[PDB]
Each structure stands twice: as structure tokens, then as C-alpha cells.
Design a protein around this ligand. Sequence first.
Ligand SMILES: Cc1cc2nc3c(=O)[nH]c(=O)nc-3n(C[C@H](O)[C@H](O)[C@H](O)COP(=O)(O)OP(=O)(O)OC[C@H]3O[C@@H](n4cnc5c(N)ncnc54)[C@H](O)[C@@H]3O)c2cc1C
Ligand SMILES: Cc1cc2nc3c(=O)[nH]c(=O)nc-3n(C[C@H](O)[C@H](O)[C@H](O)COP(=O)(O)OP(=O)(O)OC[C@H]3O[C@@H](n4cnc5c(N)ncnc54)[C@H](O)[C@@H]3O)c2cc1C
Ligand SMILES: Cc1ncc(C[n+]2csc(CCOP(=O)(O)OP(=O)(O)O)c2C)c(N)n1
Ligand SMILES: Cc1ncc(C[n+]2csc(CCOP(=O)(O)OP(=O)(O)O)c2C)c(N)n1
Ligand SMILES: [Mg+2]
Ligand SMILES: [Mg+2]
Lengths: 582, 582
Amino acid sequence: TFISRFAPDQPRKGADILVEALERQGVETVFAYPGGASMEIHQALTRSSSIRNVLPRHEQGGVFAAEGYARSSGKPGICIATSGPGATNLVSGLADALLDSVPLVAITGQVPRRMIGTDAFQETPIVEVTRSITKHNYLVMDVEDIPRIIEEAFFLATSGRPGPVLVDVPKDIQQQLAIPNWEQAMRLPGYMSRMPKPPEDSHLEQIVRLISESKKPVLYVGGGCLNSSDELGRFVELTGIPVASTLMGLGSYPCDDELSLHMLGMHGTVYANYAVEHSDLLLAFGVRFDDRVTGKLEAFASRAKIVHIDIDSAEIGKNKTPHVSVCGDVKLALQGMNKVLENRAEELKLDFGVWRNELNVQKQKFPLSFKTFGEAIPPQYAIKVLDELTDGKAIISTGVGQHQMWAAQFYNYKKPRQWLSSGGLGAMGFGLPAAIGASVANPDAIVVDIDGDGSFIMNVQELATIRVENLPVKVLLLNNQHLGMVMQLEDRFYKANRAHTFLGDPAQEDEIFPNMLLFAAACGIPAARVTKKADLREAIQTMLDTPGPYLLDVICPHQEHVLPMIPSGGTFNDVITEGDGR
Amino acid sequence: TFISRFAPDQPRKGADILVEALERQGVETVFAYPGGASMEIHQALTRSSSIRNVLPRHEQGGVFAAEGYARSSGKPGICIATSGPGATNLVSGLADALLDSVPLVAITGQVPRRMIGTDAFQETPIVEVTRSITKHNYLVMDVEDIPRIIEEAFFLATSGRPGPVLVDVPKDIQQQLAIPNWEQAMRLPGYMSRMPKPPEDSHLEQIVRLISESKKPVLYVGGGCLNSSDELGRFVELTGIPVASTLMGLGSYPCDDELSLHMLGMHGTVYANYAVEHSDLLLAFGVRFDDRVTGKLEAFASRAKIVHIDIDSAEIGKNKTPHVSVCGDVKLALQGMNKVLENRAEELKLDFGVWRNELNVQKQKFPLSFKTFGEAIPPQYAIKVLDELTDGKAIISTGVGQHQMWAAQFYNYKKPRQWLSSGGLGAMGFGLPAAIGASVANPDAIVVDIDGDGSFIMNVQELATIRVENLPVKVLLLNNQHLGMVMQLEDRFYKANRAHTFLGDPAQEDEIFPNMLLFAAACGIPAARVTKKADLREAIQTMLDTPGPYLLDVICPHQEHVLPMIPSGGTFNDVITEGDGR
Ligand SMILES: Cc1cc2nc3c(=O)[nH]c(=O)nc-3n(C[C@H](O)[C@H](O)[C@H](O)COP(=O)(O)OP(=O)(O)OC[C@H]3O[C@@H](n4cnc5c(N)ncnc54)[C@H](O)[C@@H]3O)c2cc1C
Ligand SMILES: Cc1cc2nc3c(=O)[nH]c(=O)nc-3n(C[C@H](O)[C@H](O)[C@H](O)COP(=O)(O)OP(=O)(O)OC[C@H]3O[C@@H](n4cnc5c(N)ncnc54)[C@H](O)[C@@H]3O)c2cc1C
Ligand SMILES: Cc1ncc(C[n+]2csc(CCOP(=O)(O)OP(=O)(O)O)c2C)c(N)n1
Ligand SMILES: Cc1ncc(C[n+]2csc(CCOP(=O)(O)OP(=O)(O)O)c2C)c(N)n1
Ligand SMILES: [Mg+2]
Ligand SMILES: [Mg+2]
């Protein structure tokens, strides 16, 4: 029973209907940047006693904060912007939320309805621009459609395969007085008709049947299992199948477990890729068969029977045609298969110890390794220290690059929604704002941003947002003074010819530039810089123990390479296991 | 006779054809940020001995730098980015270059042709996204189309009404070897068929005829006259008609002249708006009748015969239907009308001294005024000092807000392409990167960024670009600690109820936050902060005299309001002339 701030017979502004529509959706936090087209919304936002607004310093930071808010909680992330340049600054976040399937709802202001199409002031057709980078978008043409469109937006953004939904609201609609109807149904007939039904018991038995007939099975877990942590953990108990996770599925199955193969793919471990290559049964639960995981599709699981489970019927048979397919919630498919495995425990043999001890041979032969040069800080080792000092219980957001892979390789995430990273779009500067939204969604959680010097500076303006909002965001900056991941491809395929990848000052090469500590100092954030490996443990411990925000400039040798590596479009027999830029 | 770096019978990479296509267009500077999809281009960029690359710290800064490069020189601005997040970061600049008609060419990398549509890694349909915010865009599907598409891109971006043109280049096309054909014609039949012919002598005489018959004529000059500085200066000699410029036409006719009415519109001077309201002939040369200039269209020049000259036939009669219309280059229309006025000098009376001395009455009755409170720095006065200390010969780029209007009101720009500001889209954070491109295009010019604390922080990362590239960019920061322009609308129409407009730290209200000096310090840039009006003249003089970059944190009282003001959709009888937030 919701309690409104207005009488049921009292006319109110359209912006008041919009804010109340958010309150009725359970929204507690929004990331709104004001402007002329959304000032009525920002005015009605102050009249709400339940919706907190985190004012960013850039709308790209606002939408990225809404992603980290969403990614670290499962709730939908809500960002608000004004028309024109405010909306165009959300584009990177919307395309990012789409490719990673993040529940997000973006509300942009717009010129009055009478002015749409005249190339007016701050007038851009944001609906036409964001049509291919959003799950769905709207353009409110009447104040009475506000409750229905907002309900459809949150339903579309959260149900099925989640994604971003944009709601363009003209200025005159925000000002028009009306009495909202909260009981009008949603106009989504063909969407709901396509919502997958619970999986049939016939499909689940044949999958369980194929498990007992298989000798070398591999679990291909991805971002679709973030809500099935317990269901997947029980499923491996009854089967004993090794688990290979994606960049997005990290945390679904604990990386520190003996059955874990960690990450597979281009930068995935050798033993995980070996398991998929030489498997006879591939259980692809909650994945989309990205090119960064398969490489040449004909070589991916070429000797394996593929079982694909998805909530998006478009992903099934999209890149790799499976044997058996199940269109539905993998959380339910695991629940059904679990009670089939325990009731048929005696019937089914289920002892793949020959197969996993074949993989454990590769696990000790080709493990995740890193060199330590003198006292220079290995970035891999620095992240391994953060794992130890936080007991693997810290929410980790990252940028995109070498530091992004090392944060995925050398951290043992125990639970899902702990690993926040742009994997689909791979957007730099995602780290710092995502940690902002994650800290707001989880106030009592250790939130650490493992960013790179190139990614960190892109949205460095959000350091002011961290201090103003008093958020205990930790910034573990892995400063390599380079556009590292691009530099690595230059060393491998372009004879180490630098093409605009150095980020420091060429007039002073051996001086670390920029001095990121002064960036934190400008925003009243305590900062420190560590260079030698001995001082690394205390420095990270100081960052964690110091209350509030903290930036740690961890200096790393730039010649490091992310290993192992499979070149774009290769097979398992093309994995690069050694080598750097020295 | 161009000199290629390759034999005419030698196959070369597609990226080498692309760079050579830029060299053949006279490109001397590009603003490129590397990525996996554009690494081949960045590799071929290093092999060029004539194209300098300014590496930004954010692609939004790269495209804004290309705008300032273009806006301050008339040459086309070229920015390059990678696929996915690199391209989505150009969106704000492309929509900005479209609404302000800035010649710009954007080159984005893309996944190989065989992968377009699979929602691949860093794969977004940038052509579909940017179709409504670009003059035109391309998707290269064969390496042999590179010379033709690049030639069509630069021709479309510069000819007619200029605008942005995007060229999406897949990765496999950059790698494909070929021998380019530089002599293939452009496939633009219906574009060139619509290119306006030189204006007929019949139209120009009737315009000159209407000038002698008119008693109260007003010149409505805009961004279309930036290339007609001399032609417009001679036209007013032969007619004596007062000149009212737009936010975009600033500098076309010197603001310090006795016939100048300065800016008209929402925040335009009272005497300029009075001239248009009580005119009988309105010469609208190079304008588009924006809502920020006309307000209620029925009241705009309601008693005036409207003569509209444009190179875009779509703008003629778009918002305000004119009497006489001329579709063509205003530079030629002025040349034709000039030689008609001097050959008919004796026939035509041409003495509007009764009308301009009627306007000079309003010029002294309601001039541009500002209060000076104690020793607090008036932002208007600070800009007036910069005009004096630079002799009005400094290239000025600004953000968007209160400081943007005061930089337009209280600076006497003597020549066009000296005033760089986002007027159409009104994009914040445009100031600092635009000054970067302007300084590269005009190395020996005084480049000053009159930015606001909200706009400056959005693209503050480009301070590293200024130091690395050793550009003498001056930053005159008008720090009001608020989202000023939005705060002003709160004081006027929302009873001064603050809705997320304060940018400092609420835990320490009287402390200036953030300390922007440490931002400059982090990037090795000398900085200073002035608070008292007496120290203002020496501080600005120190900024100018100090070689290289320099940031001046000018603190201003936030209660200041931009005056005069006409509310959105009003008439001339609705102008607000006094009032602030005190
Ligand atoms: C520099 C860089 C390197 C990278 N290299 C790698 C790498 O080596 N290895 C790697 O794995 N990734 C890598 N990526 C990331 C890669 O591009 C993809 O993000 C990754 O493949 C994601 O795979 P995913 O399908 O598990 O994630 P997602 O895209 O999040 O998975 C979405 C899928 O889950 C389904 N789904 C969602 N909910 C449900 C449900 N309830 N029931 C059933 N299905 C559901 C969706 O329908 C969809 O099919 C890299 C990224 C970057 C930036
Ligand atoms: C906060 C804010 C406040 C603003 N308030 C004002 C204000 O008070 N006053 C004001 O003037 N602006 C104001 N603006 C800016 C406003 O939105 C527009 O940018 C402004 O009206 C531009 O008018 P313009 O047509 O002269 O500029 P432009 O858009 O640059 O003019 C383009 C026109 O010139 C034509 N053209 C180009 N080349 C030629 C040629 N060779 N021959 C003939 N025609 C040509 C084009 O076809 C087109 O019609 C404000 C902006 C902001 C951000
Ligand atoms: C906005 C954006 N631009 C470009 C890219 C392409 N890119 C991917 S990784 C990388 C280099 C980033 O280096 P850094 O952020 O410093 O992390 P590092 O690899 O050095 O550890 C780039 C440019 C991207 N993913 N996003
Ligand atoms: C990216 C973007 N977001 C929002 C707006 C709307 N807007 C226009 S002016 C302004 C306030 C800017 O204040 P500031 O940059 O500090 O300049 P000031 O008015 O304070 O002098 C805003 C938010 C915009 N033009 N661009
Ligand atoms: Mg780095
Ligand atoms: Mg300001």
C-alpha cells in the first residue's frame, strides 16, 4: 500500500507524476544532472523524501554510476539527464548497458512537443539516436502516459534479458497538470507473449541424460548466472563438472574452488581453454558465445555436444549451433535439473575424476604466472595482495585494458555482483563512476576501483562526486604510464612501434605524469603512491584502513603483457603463453 | 602535384590509403585516440611526415578539439576514434558540429565486415546511431572506395552549409592491400545539383531597392557571415544600417564599432532587440531564426519586411516566412549588392541617421551593466579586463552557462573565427578542448578558455593534453561554485529552490571546491587564484605574460544573473532588465 504525497483527486505537475512513478517502482537512488529541459524533474526530485540524487560531474559518469548501482545489486539503475548535450553524454553508457545486459532506465529531458524536429535549442532526436543501443525507448507525447510508460520501462529493463530503456520527456509534459492513473495496464502484448515459460521436464532429463553419457564435460558459465549463485553451486555438487566462467560470470562459481577453471577465452587460463577444446559435452549456461571467448567458431568445442540455455531465443544458435537448447531462466533450469540428479543419484554413475584430474594436470603445468623484476611492483601481485587484505569480499570495478584482465585473473570473487566491468562494449573510464554507484548501493561494502591511468583520467571529474557524497571508494590505480592493452598489441603484431600509446610527458619520460595524487588532492581525497614491492602490502593496507575515499598510485613496469593470449580469430593451438616487451 | 610515399604500382594497406587520402586533402593535424579497431590507422599515421596527431585523454575532447581547430581557421577538423566506446564518445561533438554547422570529418574504426550485426566485441552500429546528428556518414565496404569516400566526406563537410561527416572503417579494410585510384569521381549527383548558383542580379537590386524605401532597417547577422568579414564591413559603409549579431556571428562585424548593436536574442542587449522589434526592414544574412533569438515568432520583427539570405534552402521560410529570399552564398550576395550601392550612390538617399540616433538613445538608456559588490570580482569586469589586456585580439573559447554569455557580452571581438562557443547544442566542457585545437591551428595566437567550474571539470582530463603538447592555452576560469545558468533559472521561476546546482562541498560551504589549482598542478601547469578585484588586473596580466599554459581561478559571487533576459517563448515587452539572487 503506497503512500502518495498528493491527494487522489488533486492535479499535480507531470514531473511530480514522474518522480512518484519512480517511487512506486522502489527507486531509492538516481544519478541526475540538471539542465533547462529537466529542471522541472529536478524540482520535483527535491520534493521526494525517499529518492536520493547523486549529482555527478559528467552525464557519462551519471550513467556509469547507474550501471555500477545496478551491477552490484541487481536493482535497476536510474540516471537522469537534460536534452541535447546531456542526453548525448549518456550514449556510451546506454550502449554499454545493452551489450552487458544491465538493467537500466534513463530519463532525458526534451524540448516541448510543439518544437520537436525544428533543430531547436539543445534539440537532438535522442530516441532516434539511441534506438539501436537500447533495449527499448519511449517519447512521452501526453502527461497521462507517464505512469504507463514508466511501468513499461522498468518492466522491460529488468524482465527477460535485462537492458537499458530510455524515456524522453518533453518540457511541456513535465509542466502539464494532471491526475495520474496508476492502474492502467501495460501495452506489451507481443513482448509478454514471448517471455519464456518454465523449462519442460523433458528437456532437463535429456540434459541430465547427456551428462551421464559424457566422459569429459565442461561448464561454460557466464553473466546469465549472476542470480543463480546457489543453484549453480548445488548443480556442480551433484555432477562434479569443472566450471569455466566468462569475464561476466566471474563470481557465479568461486574462483578459489578446486573445481574452478577460472576464466576461458582470449585472455582466459590455459587449462580452462584446454577443457573446452577437448570436451565432449559443453554446458553453456547464461552465455552468448562472444568472439572474445570462441575465436574461430569451427574450432570452439569442435568435439563437444553443446547444450545451450538462454532467456534470449535470439542467442540460441546465433554463432554456434547447439545440440540441445533450452529457452528459459537458467535459475529454473538448474532447480529442475538439481532435483532430477539427487532422485537419480544411484542410477547415474557421475564420477568424472578421470577428466578433472586430466585438467588438474594442465592446471599445474600451465598456471597463471607473472614475473617479479627487482623491486618493481608486479600489477598481478598488487591485485593478489588486495585479494588477501580484503579476504576476497570487496566489490571490484575496473576500467578497460591490461589492468582489467589482471583484476579478473588475480582476484578470487566469491559471490556474484562483486565484479563490475565493461565487457561487451569495453568502455574506458567505467571504473571510477561504477564504484560510485556500487558504494551507494552497498554502503557497508569495501568498494575498490582497480583502474588504469588512461581509463582513470577519462572520468577523473567524478572524484569530486566521491568527496561531496562522502563515499568510501578506494582507487587502486595501476599506473603503467601507457595505453597498456593497445601497447601490448603493438609489441606483438607491430614490432613494438609506439602509435600514440604513451600517456606521460615526453619532455620528462622518467617522471610519472600526470601526478594523480594532486587529482585526489584537488577533490580533498587522501592519496599515496607506492613504487617498491616491499612497501606494497602496507600501502594497500593503509588505503583500506583509512576511512573514506583513498587513491593509491601503484606504479608498474609498462613492459608487462597480459598472458595467456589468443590472437583475434585463432584456435586453442594458437595460445601465446610467454613473452613481454623487454 | 602531390608526392606520395608509395609507388603508383605498389600495393599498400588500406590504412595507408586512408592517411594518404587525408594528406591529399591538405590535412595537417588530426585528433586521434587509439584502439583495437583503429590500430592499423594509428600505425599508418606514424608513417606520415605531414600529419601531426594530438592525442587527447577522451574522445569527446578529441572531437571538441577538432571543432576548435575548425572553428578558429575555417579548415575542416578531423578527429579519429576506435569502435564501440571510442565512437560513442564522439556523439556529443558530432551533434554539436551539426547544429553549429562546423566543418568536421570523423573517422571511426569498426569490426571486420564479416562481423557487422552480431553484437560483437566493441561493436556498435555507429552509422545508425549518428545518422540524425551528422550531415552525412559512410560505411566503407571495400578498400577501393577509400579515396572516393574520403573525397566525398571532405567535400560534404566543407561545401554548402558545413557539417560533420563520419566515415566508419572496418578493421579488415584497413589491412587489405590495394592500389588506390585517386582519379575516381564523386557519387554526389543530387547534392551538387542542389548547390546554390551565384545570386541573380535581379534579386540583389530589389533588396537594395527595399533598403532605400525603408526608414528603420536592421542587419540580422549570424554564423553564416564568418567568411564575409570584409564584404559585410563594406556593405554597412554604403548603407549605414545598424548591425545586430548572433551568438555565432560575433566578430563578423566589430563589437566596438558605433554602428554595432552587439548581440540580439534571449540574452541580447536591449537596444539590439529594440531595433528588430521596431524595424521596417530586417536583413537576415547567415542566420537560422533560432528560438533563442526570436522567442514568440509572431512578435519577432512583426512590423518589418524580412529579407532572408541563406545557403540552405531548408532554412528559408522555416520558422519565419520572409518577403524576399535569396538562396546562395551571402559572401557573393554582399559583393553583388556592394557594387550596386556605389554605382547608384547618388540615386539612393541612404541616410538612416534618424533611425540609428533613435537606437543610440536606447543604447545609452539601457546599456550592458553590472554591479560591483565590495572587492568581490564581477565576472563581467574580469572579462572586460581580458579584453583590455589582450587588445581584443585573443581567440576565446568558452563552455556553456553564465560565463558563456558574459564572454559574449563583455568582449569586443574584432574578427570572425575568434569566438569559439557551443551555441546550437550548447555542450558543456566544450571550452578547454576547443582551445586545444584552436592553439594548434593558430600557434602564435593568444588562446584563452573562459570556462565555468562546471564545464571546466567535465573535460578537465584534457589539461594533460595541453602540457604534453606544450600548447599556450590560457584558462580564465570564472568559478561561481554553482551550475550558474541553471541556478539563475531557479531564482527566477522556482523561488530560488536549489535542485542539485551547487558544485562545491556542502561539508565546507565557504571553501572553494574543487581546488582547480591542484588540477593544473597535477598536469604540470602553473596556476593561480584571484579573489579581490584589485588583484584582478595583475593576475590576468600574469596569466598572459607567463609562457605556456596557465590556469587562473577567478572567484565570483554566485548570486550574479545574466542580464538582460527574455523568458523562453516571450516577446520584447517581456525583457527582464534588473534583478539577481540577493
Ligand atoms: C579487453 C577485453 C578482453 C576480453 N576478453 C574476454 C575473455 O578472455 N573471456 C571472456 O569470457 N570475456 C572477455 N571479454 C568480454 C567479452 O567481450 C564478453 O563480455 C564476454 O564474452 C561475456 O560473455 P557472457 O555471455 O557470459 O556475458 P553476458 O553478455 O553478460 O551474457 C548474456 C547472456 O546471458 C543470457 N542471460 C541473461 N540472463 C539469463 C537467464 N536468467 N537465464 C538464461 N540466460 C540468461 C542472455 O540472454 C545472454 O545470452 C573481454 C572484454 C574486454 C574489454
Ligand atoms: C545558454 C545559451 C544562450 C543562448 N542565447 C542566445 C542569444 O541570446 N542570442 C543568439 O543569437 N544566440 C543564442 N544562443 C545560441 C543559439 O542557440 C544559436 O546558436 C544562435 O541563434 C545561432 O544563430 P545563427 O543562425 O546566426 O548561427 P548558425 O546556426 O551558425 O547559422 C547557420 C545559418 O547560416 C547559414 N549559412 C552558413 N553559411 C552560409 C553562407 N555562406 N551563405 C549564406 N548562409 C550561410 C546556414 O545555412 C544557416 O542558415 C544561445 C546559446 C546558449 C548555449
Ligand atoms: C573509450 C575507449 N577508448 C578506447 C578503447 C580501446 N582501448 C581498450 S584498452 C585501452 C588502453 C587503456 O589503457 P589503460 O586504461 O591505461 O589500462 P592499461 O591497459 O594501461 O592497464 C584502449 C585505448 C576503449 N576500450 N575505450
Ligand atoms: C553537458 C551539459 N549538461 C547540461 C547542460 C545544461 N546547462 C546549461 S548551462 C549549465 C550550468 C553550467 O554552469 P557552469 O558550467 O559552471 O557555468 P556557469 O553558468 O556557472 O558560469 C547547464 C547544467 C549543458 N548545456 N550541457
Ligand atoms: Mg594504464
Ligand atoms: Mg560556473
